[PDB]
């Protein structure tokens, strides 16, 4: 199916304590493949997936230069934005950047994206056409005019429609044994009485990849949200993901309920019931 490549950067100012903390991570779909951490000893972009380790010295040198340059730009930007907002030098502030590209199952470009935040709020974003920006507030209108003068959208679009998709295609081929394999969920169900009249049914999905999944409880074949609890999809720590969905049911009526599981690794959705 479809695939994505995304980079996430976070810069945090540290008032009265020198340089900000800068962390960069890169992903192909839900798999991290590179990192840079300003607090780490190497001061290099480092590998985080086996299939990127084959890239040569020139690749690691250029990636390191890219992320170091972005960290320097962010450190200046933290001070510039503090000025646009008339904030004091006392507080810690954060800049976040996300960018990346999506390709279809045939490897062709689908969409590109670049968005930035300041203190957890939207600051500026590249529009869908990759030719203009949307500023979230008046401070961001100053940045928008600078970026128009710098032809920043042309640079972003050239990267997103070019190098981004070409390198994503190379990574998908080099790491195909893991990146292009789906791991369907392994499902099970538990039952826990709560009182002499109700019980919790919990539907589990474990060991799946990619992370996108849908768990839905139905009662008499009708979707139900009342008396349900769905936890956020979480990482197992081994490259796979987990999720559960629970419903509180009257004891004696468990057979009215079914858990429906949808995932890319399943050609047909699963339907689980408490007893056979």
């Amino acid at each position: 199916g479809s695939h994505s490549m995304r980079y996430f950067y976070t810069s945090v100012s540290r008032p009265g304590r020198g340089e900000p903390r800068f962390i960069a991570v890169g992903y192909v779909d839900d798999t991290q493949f590179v990192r840079f951490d300003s607090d780490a000893a190497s001061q290099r972009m480092e590998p985080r997936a086996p299939w990127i380790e084959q890239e040569g010295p020139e690749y690691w040198d250029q990636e390191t230069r890219n992320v170091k340059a972005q960290s320097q730009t962010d450190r200046v930007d933290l001070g510039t934005l503090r000025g646009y907002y008339n904030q004091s030098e006392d507080g810690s502030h954060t800049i976040q950047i996300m960018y990346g590209c999506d390709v279809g199952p045939d490897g062709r470009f689908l969409r590109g994206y670049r968005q930035d935040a300041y203190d957890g709020k939207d600051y500026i974003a590249l529009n869908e056409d990759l030719r203009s920006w949307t500023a979230a507030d008046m401070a961001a209108q100053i940045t928008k005019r600078k970026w128009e003068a710098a032809h920043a959208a042309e640079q972003q679009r050239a990267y997103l429609e070019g190098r981004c998709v070409e390198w994503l295609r190379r990574y998908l081929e080099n790491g195909k044994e893991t990146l292009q394999r789906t791991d369907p969920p392994k499902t099970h169900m538990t039952h826990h009485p709560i009182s002499d009249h109700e019980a919790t049914l919990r539907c589990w999905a474990l060991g799946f990849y990619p992370a996108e999944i849908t768990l839905t409880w139905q009662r008499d074949g009708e979707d139900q949200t009342q008396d349900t609890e769905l936890v956020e999809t979480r990482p197992a720590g081994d490259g796979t993901f987990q999720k559960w969905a629970a419903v509180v049911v009257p004891s004696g009526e468990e057979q009215r309920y079914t858990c429906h599981v949808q995932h890319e690794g399943l050609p047909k959705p699963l339907t689980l019931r408490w007893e056979l």
Binding site: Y7, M45, N66, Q70, V76, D77, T143, K146, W147
Partner: peptide, 9 residues
């Protein structure tokens, strides 16, 4: 492959 272009805000 990360982006190589940056310009001040």
């Amino acid at each position: 492959n990360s982006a190589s272009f940056s310009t001040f805000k």
